[PDB]
Ligand binder design. Structure first.
Ligand SMILES: [Cl-]
Lengths: 178, 178
């Protein structure tokens, strides 16, 4: 990841509640264990051990209401709280094989979107996501759902960050308000 | 042991699906397997959704201030908001093997407690928990901390419910007030 050591420490403080002094002591222990790590690399390893998923390169003000079918997946960068999780199901490929697909409904301060997890993304994320959790979606293909809602398609080329550190998260209404 | 109606209520809470949507999923499972009862089909749906059904999730008025070392783990039923999460660590067992252990600090309207996740409980819950989340702790052993205060030990017997449906939750102060 290209995130600086200070940015990683800021994310760790927000996600763990540890003081800066406690976090620095954890980084020192990691560096004492591995002399090849830089301070940034040690901070990234600490984030990983804490179950914090860091994006390789970080920002966007984009809202769900701004998504449109066929937009460049490189422009897709939205956050949303999970409102609904539907059961995973099987689908048949043109080659005759069977894959997996699972759908969720997420929302931000602007609207809702269906999020479609494909194949390994179901095994990778489906049980990790809970209703009320916030996800950040990157590099997803956008399709028009039969409903009208934008559809974010999460395949092996897309990225999901569970409970991201992002300024848009605080503007998403809580579940009770929806 | 949980009734079909109780399983549907848990599925509604954990997925946000409507009762009508859940019933339709149970119908599909029953149409696939004629040997399942309605309760068995609801339990299979919960399992496919990644929901672990806790057979004893009773209500209690118990507070963290009422915990004492050596109290009956069957009486242990407390809720708390997560204030701090420390990194998972390795520890050495009496047999020479290496296990994992991770600690959190939680608090309710009455006080704070260290929560210690042992071995598979770290893999099972640690990444699912975040600061500000509320957890319900059941069947944990209570030990005296190095400062003479009660700590909750989450071993094989213990259970944790993430963001529980419990009347005590609304009484826990938000992070900003602490
Ligand atoms: Cl919420």
């Amino acid at each position: 990841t290209v995130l600086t050591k200070d940015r990683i420490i800021e994310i760790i403080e927000r996600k763990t509640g540890m003081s800066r002094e406690e976090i620095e002591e954890e980084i020192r222990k990691i560096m004492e264990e591995d002399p090849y790590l830089s301070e940034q690399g040690a901070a990234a390893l600490l984030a990983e051990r804490l179950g914090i998923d860091l994006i390789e390169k970080e920002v966007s003000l984009m809202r769900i209401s701004e998504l449109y079918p066929g937009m460049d997946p490189r422009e897709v960068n939205v956050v949303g709280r999970v409102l609904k999780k539907y059961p995973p199901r099987e689908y048949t490929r043109k080659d005759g094989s069977v894959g997996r697909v699972a759908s969720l409904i997420i929302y931000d301060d602007s609207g809702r979107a269906r999020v479609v997890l494909w194949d390994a993304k179901v095994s990778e994320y489906y049980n990790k996501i809970e209703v009320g959790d916030v996800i950040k979606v990157l590099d997803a293909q956008v399709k028009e759902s039969l409903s009208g809602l934008p559809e974010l398609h999460i395949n092996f080329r897309a990225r999901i960050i569970l409970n991201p550190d992002d300024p848009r998260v605080e503007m998403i209404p809580p579940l009770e308000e929806v």
